Ligand binder design. Sequence first.
Ligand SMILES: CCOP(=O)(COc1ccc(C[C@H](NC(=O)O[C@H]2CO[C@H]3OCC[C@H]32)[C@H](O)CN(CC(C)C)S(=O)(=O)c2ccc3ncsc3c2)cc1)OCC
Lengths: 99, 99
Amino acid sequence: PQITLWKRPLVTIKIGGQLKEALLDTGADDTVLEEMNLPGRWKPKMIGGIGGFIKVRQYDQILIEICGHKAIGTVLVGPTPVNVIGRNLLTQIGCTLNF
Amino acid sequence: PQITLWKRPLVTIKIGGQLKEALLDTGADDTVLEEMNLPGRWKPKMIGGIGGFIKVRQYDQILIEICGHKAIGTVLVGPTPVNVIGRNLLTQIGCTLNF
Ligand SMILES: CCOP(=O)(COc1ccc(C[C@H](NC(=O)O[C@H]2CO[C@H]3OCC[C@H]32)[C@H](O)CN(CC(C)C)S(=O)(=O)c2ccc3ncsc3c2)cc1)OCC
């Protein structure tokens, strides 16, 4: 679909079997979700944002459905202000910017 | 144009008579640029993301040219680690997400 930007581009995602709401974020290299329980191994990682760095749990090769489009990739879980879908998954569902 | 997301969506902007590089960032409500002496009055503001908040100066009705497309709106100036073009200006140049 074509998504305009007058409102936040929030979409429904399915991850770990649970539905969540997330922001399509072209300024994010990586996908970062708020604290949740996810099945699978994870490793400690750090990521930097506008205000500095935070600690996250890095889950690899996670299945995630974004508006019905399937992606399988890295998901970071930690104290982000909002769930963000980053370019690592936006590229998998074929997302481009157009103007 | 059409911008894929394999790499950071960086573009050249013209603001305050100067050329800069900035991200087209659908996850940013507002436009945030590196420290630069814009003339005119401004208001203090705090904006938050991953890692916490930074202090910025809010300038209103600022002209920016983005890859040949002109836009006018609020620009926040401060010690941001990267320049982001946010939705307040992306809507003006007719930018959409497409997948
Ligand atoms: C020099 C490198 O420094 P650096 O490595 C990190 O630099 C950066 C810093 C910020 C960005 C853009 C942001 N991306 C992001 O956080 O992505 C992270 C996840 O993926 C990784 O890739 C990029 C970083 C990692 C988002 O697109 C937009 N944010 C909001 C969302 C909801 C979080 S916003 O910026 O907080 C923002 C903007 C306008 C606004 N108006 C009212 S609120 C408000 C908040 C890109 C690179 O370390 C720090 C020293």
